[PDB]
Ligand binder design. Structure first.
Ligand SMILES: NC(=[NH2+])NCCC[C@H](N)C(=O)O
Ligand SMILES: NC(=[NH2+])NCCC[C@H](N)C(=O)O
Lengths: 360, 360
């Protein structure tokens, strides 16, 4: 079976890497506004529905081709989504929208064992994102993998908190503490990236795009073999867990200094090593439209002792080096603008290893 | 758990019954043309996209309200889809269309144990049909049921045989013999009604709307607990199996005289009773837009000795009576026009019983 991955560190053999092509600025709706930094609001207000800066996309394409070259050298089979125009306007009975991109496979696909799971998504601009990956998924299906598509939400207004403290309010930390974000509990919804795998245990975070209904759906779908746990952090704008609590080895995790975990004791007690990375060195003047600066810790492990880290982040490189971890430096400064690091731009289809417990 | 049904005959306790409201004539595309009798082509060519005759829909609504009254008297909890306007035009990146109806729950939902499964569908006009049932499904989910949505196809041209012997060709029997219909094997697709449950064994038929990919998806999704078997019949236009091979009891099945099963020996050898019903008596002048006359055998079992049969079909009533089966006569002559009998207008959510084997 081509599909087989139980965690984030076993020897990588096959991966899907996203595309920067035809990426489009999402329409500036409630859920998009909730994610965007004040700094970029004008960009969104004017660019919404049109392609992200073509000059920038050309550089991102270049950067990702090089990253694929390197993965190939490291002995990894690379698959890529199909090219699609994300500017096509679609209309369901509940809403109308233009698309985003197929840059982040991690956002939409998660592999648990020999099964590929397509997350429902929570953003209107990402409703039909799965279309880019069907050619790859049908092939794995023909070859034996299990294929599951979690329930696709209606994404009706009812799913969003029309009156969320968007604009700037920060007490959104208070709602955050109450497990309350821009998505309601109207229907299940989640991005695959809010889940991070550690064998028989999977950790999930209730974020702006992943609700309790979505988490419960996964937990209930993977039981009894896998245990899905919920963990939270200090963060007024959570979306995906891989730039907050990135698990890089059996009992080793990278915890974002700015986003501490309320349940860190579960891990200290289990005898896990909690490493806090150094601060990103990316200039404040570089466009990070969909994200924070912490993409530096969004690393991808080729195996336990090999990490693909950003060429520009020397401090985090040094940290891995003192730990005895071989750093493979790839530069993706421009691809970073679309919202992800290596963990986000990929989806590990097959790693060599077995289903085990590490919290045990 | 509200959801619990392993076969078609155990004591019925809860059911979803469809709605005739706002039903719309589907656009006359390849897959629709393949299903429609020459007789109704003008009706489709002119009515496509508009509501089915309002005068007729009013009678169907009346008939179904009475059927719900009766189910209530028989001690069955009745749930109904939410009212929706099926005339709304939607547009995915692959196609554009108007809707059909939420009259046939059997077409889209199937319950295996404590799990509700939403079929992907194969008709463009039925892409968003699931929207009518989400309120009911979320409630069962909150109450403990498992909820699965099979992969939703793109329904791109590639899924359909643009040059299928539609118009009238009959050698479509030859393709039929080759397992070839109007849907290709491009991506998985199926209507839930092509599957019929008998405990640990489920029988499926490759039809115009259910391909081998769709069958394989189910088989692979329900293994190891349930065995999905494929069976075929003499039929140049298969769609749903419940008016062809309707299983009404442990080891008892109604086989359509005109649609014999190529694998009938599996059943004779298992010691099953194969009953062939009498011919329908519905007048040839009554509009049967979406179906054949055989809706008469599309019965619904309240339990092993109680069947809900059409008030007008005396001959089939007599047959059940000689068998010691109590007939509950409900008239749905007009609802028949939308395409189904009792088995089609409903979906059994809960029946009292256990998972057993009957082929054993
Ligand atoms: N899979 C992903 N797209 N991960 C990116 C995480 C970025 C995170 N929301 C941040 O701003 O730090
Ligand atoms: N679940 C259903 N809609 N069943 C109806 C089956 C009708 C069948 N295609 C016929 O013409 O005999």
């Amino acid at each position: 079976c081509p599909v087989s991955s139980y965690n984030e560190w076993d020897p990588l053999e096959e991966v899907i890497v996203g595309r920067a092509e035809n990426a489009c600025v999402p329409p500036f709706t409630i859920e998009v506004k909730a994610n965007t930094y004040e700094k970029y609001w004008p960009f969104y207000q004017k660019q919404g529905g049109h392609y992200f800066p073509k000059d920038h996309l050309k550089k991102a394409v270049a950067e990702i081709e090089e990253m694929c070259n390197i993965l190939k050298t490291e002995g990894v089979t690379v698959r890529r989504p199909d090219p699609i125009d994300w500017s096509l306007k679609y209309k369901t009975p509940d809403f109308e929208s233009t698309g985003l991109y197929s840059a982040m496979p991690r956002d939409i696909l998660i592999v648990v064992g020999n099964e590929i799971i397509e997350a429902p998504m929570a953003w209107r601009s990402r409703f039909f994102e799965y279309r880019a990956y069907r050619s790859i998924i049908k092939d794995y299906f023909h070859r034996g993998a299990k294929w599951t598509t979690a329930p696709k939400p209606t994404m009706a207004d009812e799913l969003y908190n029309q009156d969320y403290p968007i604009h700037s309010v920060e007490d959104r930390h208070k709602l955050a503490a109450q497990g309350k974000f821009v998505t309601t509990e109207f229907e299940p919804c989640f991005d695959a990236a809010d889940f991070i795998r550690a064998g028989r245990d999977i950790f999930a975070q209730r974020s702006q795009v992943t609700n309790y209904l979505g988490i419960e759906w996964m937990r209930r779908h993977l039981a009894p073999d896998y245990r899905v746990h919920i963990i939270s952090f200090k963060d007024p704008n959570p979306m995906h867990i891989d730039a907050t609590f990135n698990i890089i080895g059996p009992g080793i995790v990278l915890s974002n200094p700015d986003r501490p975990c309320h349940q860190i004791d579960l891990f200290k007690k289990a005898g896990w090593t909690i490493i806090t990375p150094p601060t990103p060195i990316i200039p404040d003047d570089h466009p990070l439209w969909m994200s924070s600066k912490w993409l530096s810790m969004n690393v991808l492990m080729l195996d336990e002792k090999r990490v693909m880290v950003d060429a520009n982040e020397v401090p985090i490189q040094k940290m891995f080096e003192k730990l005895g971890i071989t750093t493979i430096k790839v530069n993706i400064r421009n691809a970073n603008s679309l919202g992800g690091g290596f963990h986000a731009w990929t989806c590990d289809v097959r790693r060599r290893g077995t289903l085990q417990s590490y919290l045990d």
